[PDB]
Design a protein around this nucleic acid. Structure first.
Ligand SMILES: [Mg+2]
Ligand SMILES: [Mg+2]
Ligand SMILES: [Mg+2]
Ligand SMILES: [Mg+2]
Ligand SMILES: [Mg+2]
Ligand SMILES: [Mg+2]
Ligand SMILES: [Mg+2]
Ligand SMILES: [Mg+2]
Ligand SMILES: [Mg+2]
Ligand SMILES: [Mg+2]
Ligand SMILES: [Mg+2]
Ligand SMILES: [Mg+2]
Ligand SMILES: [Mg+2]
Ligand SMILES: [Mg+2]
Ligand SMILES: [Mg+2]
Ligand SMILES: [Mg+2]
Ligand SMILES: [Mg+2]
Ligand SMILES: [Mg+2]
Ligand SMILES: [Mg+2]
Ligand SMILES: [Mg+2]
Ligand SMILES: [Mg+2]
Ligand SMILES: [Mg+2]
Ligand SMILES: [Mg+2]
Ligand SMILES: [Mg+2]
Ligand SMILES: [Mg+2]
Ligand SMILES: [Mg+2]
Ligand SMILES: [Mg+2]
Ligand SMILES: [Zn+2]
Lengths: 142, 54, 38, 176, 209
RNA sequence: GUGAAGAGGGAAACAACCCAGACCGCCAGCUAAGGUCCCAAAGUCAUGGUUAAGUGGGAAACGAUGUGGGAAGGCCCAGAC
RNA sequence: GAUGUCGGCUCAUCACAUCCUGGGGCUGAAGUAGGUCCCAAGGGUAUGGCUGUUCGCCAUUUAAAGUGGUACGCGAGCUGG
RNA sequence: GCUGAAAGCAUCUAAGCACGAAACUUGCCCCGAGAUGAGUUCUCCCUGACUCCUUGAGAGUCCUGAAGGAACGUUGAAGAC
């Protein structure tokens, strides 16, 4: 016959909350991307976003080993000639802390419209309070 | 092309273990300094060896 | 300061010390002996 | 090693608090508090504190020795207190003290007002000298270093600020 | 601190008693009515909204008329916002006059400059023309080269070309304030301010300093 | 030997490199090279070491109290450095 | 079964092996002015005479009159010496 | 540079603290919520019936057209349109 494929209208998505304090950046991010993609479900389907909404708290207290704190360099080109801006991990934590986690996870999620749809399901917060108490997020002890 | 080239300099192919320079009649430390100075002018790693019976 | 690939002790007072992963010679006697590796 | 194993001595009338890795000495010259490295272990025998490396850390002994030296300096600072004297050797180089502002006249076209930190006290026994007192060896050294960096000793005449302990090594202006 | 909204009446000179002619710009800085006060608790930033002049009764639309009537002020011809420093505090309806620049020596005047239309490269970026003769062909004012070659094989962003010049917001900074006549609602600045006569200017106190 | 005249898997992409020679079909299983954190299928596998350099993930003579292992040797509780 | 080839003009953009300004070490650095090395690419970086010349010489300036890559940049942008 | 051991000393570093340039992040000016992550704050407007059913975030008829916009005209120190 034909192998079961999940149907996007009938998928079930849950809300988890993960406190990212003291965790290692990349080792948190791999699990975040796994659960955003839905690789932890029996009905995983490559062309269906079956993942779970995840809310990352305390995004400024993520930890990195070694000297990566003052030596990991986030490059990006504005598109104007000569506009290769860069910012170290500590500067980027200071200015826009949640972008660190966001880039960490966006690099691991697949590239494409489905990957963007998956990354729409990740909520990264600098602090500890999160708006989405209405969705009853589950404590996900990653 | 158009033939081989002209002889320009003469070399001596060196294989590991070849005892290049030898010296006698000097103190050992001065020999070490002299050999260090000489080896500094050569394109091959060297080492300091002594005489043995066999 | 001498920025040289080969830093050595140049007298009895020259002292080898590695700061910030860079080898330097600090001499209390002759300031001409201040070297770093580069 | 040797320094790490050499214990401190806790004199009369000084309080020694220990919370986690923060240690605190309240003497007669004031109050001091230092957060030691995690690899450090401080015991008691409340007369000679002693130090050891914690298990599971790399250098261990280096951290223990540096903490022992720090606490030796802290006890000396709270009992007798460190004191450093600076001189101003030059043409009309002068120092004055107004509370906690040291005013330097060093040939600059503007007076040099140096604000003393929290617990460092300055005096001018003479119009060409400064005497600094404080219970923190690192703090007093930093103050003296900044004062000297205002005008480091010239190699040709030794003008400028200097420590008393300092042999300003000179050289004669070259001949010819 | 806050500024005011004025109208560029024109430009004149002031003959000081020592025979010096200051070229001043005259700004009709009449009263500005505060229609709204924005605070952190409701807006995330401290600012005031002011209006000036007066607008046609039948051309003040119902939403704008309601917004003004909330403050209780007569409908002005526009709305501008001024961010607030922490010390200062204004209330709704307050009429702020040009006497605010009584003790201010230098101001910043921002307004929409004159629109030069579609300005070529020579006008817009001061490109140098090419030989009017010496054999030149149909290229007496063209921009010339606009790139390199196969590398990079593209024209870079921000390149200077022809286009729309002027008609944009321009801020002339640190203009000396000569006279502040509150009884006629006038501000007199030393120098030329952006825009044509009758345009709207925003005059703030100096920010460089 | 391969390509030419050989597809397929690996080396990111990469005729000629490694594995392997496509008769056709299958929504069956076991493997080679190469791999098993996410992209991206498979070990956040177990045991014991090493590195602290983002080395790994470009490069030499030469330099250096980096650190780990080994075989010696010199001076030492008449207490040595 | 065609990728226009020197120089000039207009327009640039990047590298740093930096010419100037900015921060330092050593000096056979008294001071002014230097020599040399380290960090630094934000901005600036001549006008003329000769020659088709880039180049070079010369005159006179300037804080300086940088070295290079960009099809020895730039002819569907100009010229044609 | 301070304090400071590893290495009883010494040492700017291995923990800890300090200073340090036109480079970097801001501060100055302009654009900027198509920032699909499409934000915020004011204000204004519209609160009538009735069928059919393929009962769906359904289709349709009647009555009703609001705030506003657009169109047209006179035009502008706005403009190729
Ligand atoms: Mg116009
Ligand atoms: Mg010209
Ligand atoms: Mg013509
Ligand atoms: Mg053939
Ligand atoms: Mg093949
Ligand atoms: Mg074959
Ligand atoms: Mg293949
Ligand atoms: Mg490859
Ligand atoms: Mg492939
Ligand atoms: Mg076959
Ligand atoms: Mg298998
Ligand atoms: Mg997998
Ligand atoms: Mg063709
Ligand atoms: Mg450089
Ligand atoms: Mg740059
Ligand atoms: Mg800047
Ligand atoms: Mg010339
Ligand atoms: Mg002539
Ligand atoms: Mg000529
Ligand atoms: Mg060319
Ligand atoms: Mg060129
Ligand atoms: Mg040409
Ligand atoms: Mg042509
Ligand atoms: Mg062309
Ligand atoms: Mg072409
Ligand atoms: Mg001809
Ligand atoms: Mg010491
Ligand atoms: Zn020396």
């Amino acid at each position: 016959m034909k192998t079961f494929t999940a149907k996007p209208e009938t998928v079930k998505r849950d809300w988890y909350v993960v406190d990212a304090t003291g965790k290692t950046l990349g080792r948190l991010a791999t699990e975040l991307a796994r659960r955003l993609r839905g690789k932890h479900k029996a009905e995983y389907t490559p062309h269906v976003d079956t993942g779970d909404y995840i809310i990352v708290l305390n995004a400024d207290k993520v930890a990195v080993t070694g000297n990566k704190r003052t030596d990991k360099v986030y490059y990006h080109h504005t598109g104007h000639i000569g506009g290769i801006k860069q910012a170290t991990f500590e500067e980027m934590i200071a200015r826009r802390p949640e972008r660190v986690i966001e880039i960490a996870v966006k690099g691991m999620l697949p590239k494409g419209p489905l990957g963007r749809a998956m990354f729409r399901k990740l909520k990264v917060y600098a602090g500890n309070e999160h708006n989405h108490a209405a969705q009853q997020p589950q404590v996900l002890d990653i | 092309g158009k033939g081989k080239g002209n002889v320009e300099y003469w070399v001596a192919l060196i294989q590991p273990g070849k005892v290049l320079y030898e010296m006698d009649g000097v103190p050992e430390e001065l020999a070490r300094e002299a050999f260090k100075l000489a080896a500094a002018k050569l394109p091959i790693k060297t080492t300091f060896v002594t005489k043995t019976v066999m | 300061m001498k920025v040289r690939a080969s830093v050595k002790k140049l007298c009895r007072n020259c002292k080898i010390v590695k700061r910030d992963g860079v080898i330097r010679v600090i001499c209390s006697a002759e300031p001409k002996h201040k070297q770093r590796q580069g | 090693s040797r320094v790490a194993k050499a214990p401190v001595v806790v004199p009369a009338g000084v309080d020694v608090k220990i919370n986690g890795q923060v240690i605190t000495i309240k003497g007669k010259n004031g109050e001091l508090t230092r957060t030691l490295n995690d690899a450090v272990e401080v015991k008691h025998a409340d007369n000679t504190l002693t130090f050891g490396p914690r298990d599971g850390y790399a250098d261990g002994w280096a951290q223990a020795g540096t903490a022992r030296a720090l606490l030796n300096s802290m006890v000396i600072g709270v009992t007798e207190g460190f004191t450093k004297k600076l001189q101003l050797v030059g043409v009309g180089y002068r120092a004055a003290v107004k509370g906690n502002v040291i005013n330097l006249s060093l040939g600059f076209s503007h007076p040099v007002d140096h604000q003393l930190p929290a617990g460092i006290t300055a005096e001018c026994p003479t119009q060409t000298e400064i005497v600094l007192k404080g219970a923190d060896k690192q703090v007093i050294g930093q103050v003296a270093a900044d004062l000297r960096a205002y005008r480091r000793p010239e190699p040709y005449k030794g003008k400028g600020v200097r420590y008393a302990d300092e042999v300003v090594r000179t050289k004669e202006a070259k001949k010819k | 601190m806050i500024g005011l909204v004025g109208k560029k009446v024109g430009m004149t000179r002031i003959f000081t008693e020592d025979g010096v002619s200051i070229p001043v710009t005259v700004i009709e800085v009449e009263a500005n009515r505060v229609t709204q006060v924005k605070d952190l608790a409701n807006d995330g930033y401290r600012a005031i909204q002011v209006t000036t002049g007066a607008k046609k009764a039948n051309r003040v639309t119902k939403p704008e008329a309601g917004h003004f009537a909330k403050a209780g002020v007569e409908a002005g011809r526009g709305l501008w916002e001024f961010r607030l420093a922490e010390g200062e505090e204004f209330t709704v309806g307050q009429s702020i006059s040009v006497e605010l620049f009584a003790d201010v020596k230098k101001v910043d005047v921002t307004g929409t400059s004159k629109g030069k239309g579609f300005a070529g490269t020579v006008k817009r970026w001061n490109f140098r023309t090419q030989d009017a003769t010496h054999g030149n062909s149909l290229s007496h004012r063209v921009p010339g080269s606009i790139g390199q070659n196969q590398t990079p094989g593209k024209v870079f962003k921000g390149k200077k070309m022809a286009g729309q010049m002027g008609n944009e917001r321009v801020t002339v900074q640190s203009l000396d304030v000569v006279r502040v006549d509150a009884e006629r609602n006038l501000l007199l600045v030393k120098g030329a301010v952006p825009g044509a006569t009758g345009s709207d200017l925003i005059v703030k106190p100096a920010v460089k300093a």
